[PDB]
């Protein structure tokens, strides 16, 4: 019983603002070029969560869309990649839980252009970099104790949300 | 549920 959030962020140059896909997995799909412009669900057992969840999550990943725009602009500098256009980000954070629903292990490995990037370990306190630019991300994600906060999310709305998800089976 | 802690690169 996992909880994965594959956050596909394609810059889609030319036409304008980046075209964002937020397919998550246990589910949901935030196509930023769809018609709803709200967090349209793609799972049966998520409808049972009401306006205390739909609006909250919708605004949360509306914020996450701008966060991914900013981080994509950041990797324009980090890798110093070609500014010719499209460059896809693949976020893959999440956490596993035992059948008991407690935090088994967490995993936040980043993937820019298919390959590897900063990756979280089994200890959930220290990441594991992948190249020269990843160490810059290490610096800021270990300085602000972002490891602790992503831990308590993975020991948190990851664990608690997956608890509610397992409870969704009545 | 899509952590409201979206940490930046």
């Amino acid at each position, epitope marked *: 019983h996992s909880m994965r959030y594959f956050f596909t962020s394609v810059s889609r140059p030319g036409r304008g603002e980046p075209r964002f896909i937020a397919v998550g997995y246990v589910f949901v799909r935030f196509d930023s070029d769809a018609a709803s412009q709200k967090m349209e669900p793609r799972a049966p057992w998520i409808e049972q969560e009401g306006p205390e969840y739909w609006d909250q999550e919708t605004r949360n990943m509306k914020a996450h869309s*701008q*966060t991914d725009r900013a981080n994509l602009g950041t990797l324009r500098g980090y890798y110093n990649q070609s500014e010719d256009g499209s460059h896809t980000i693949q976020i893959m954070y999440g956490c596993d839980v035992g059948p008991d629903g407690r935090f088994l292990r967490g995993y936040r490995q980043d993937a820019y252009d298919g390959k590897d990037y900063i990756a979280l370990n089994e200890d959930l306190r220290s990441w594991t970099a992948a190249d020269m630019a990843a160490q810059i991300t290490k610096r800021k994600w270990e300085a602000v104790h972002a490891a602790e*906060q992503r831990r308590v999310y993975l020991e*948190g709305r990851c*664990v608690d949300g997956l608890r509610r998800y397992l409870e969704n089976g009545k | 549920f899509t952590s409201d802690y979206y*940490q*930046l690169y």
Partner: T-cell receptor
Amino acid sequence: VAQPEDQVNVAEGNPLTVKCTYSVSGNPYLFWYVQYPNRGLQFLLKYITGDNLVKGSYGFEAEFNKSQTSFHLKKPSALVSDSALYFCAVRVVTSGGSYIPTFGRGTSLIVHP
Amino acid sequence: GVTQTPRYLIKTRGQQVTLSCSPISGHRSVSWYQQTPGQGLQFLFEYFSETQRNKGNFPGRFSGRQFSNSRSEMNVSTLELGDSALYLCASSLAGDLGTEAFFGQGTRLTVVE
């Protein structure tokens, strides 16, 4: 956070004893906020992980103690400028991962000269 | 710092007010605080890039909203006597546990009957 002493009386050069007690159902992510007069709250020091004996701005320090469940802001040398309302803020991290800062009722450290 | 307008304001009962907060350059998270002499510093509500992430314990007549450029505004419509306090705004990077929290100088309001 429950700051017990509303008015702490410390002479110039005595161990500051700004008592902070926290009651949380989770790990202590503690923070000290000094509210200088005619200004807003400024950051003093934090304990997230690592050494129990922490240090912060303006020479302040704290001793996170599990033996007392307390986070006393201690300062061996007292200055008159220390006369401010000190807030002990525990950031109860929401399940999502956003910090909701819950402060104490305010300790009026007068630092009597 | 977090520049705040209006700095100080007076209104009557039932009148509408609007307070403005602009975070630090590059900061995209904004919190709102209210400082009552009696109850201390209370959390109002926190915004993060057009998204209210957290909210405190205040009546339904306390509302706020943040635009695309991280600028946030707070407005109060039906003014009761308990609305006399200092209203603080905060900033952050993304709601990091160790990103500190730059607070503003606040706006103090009092409601004359």
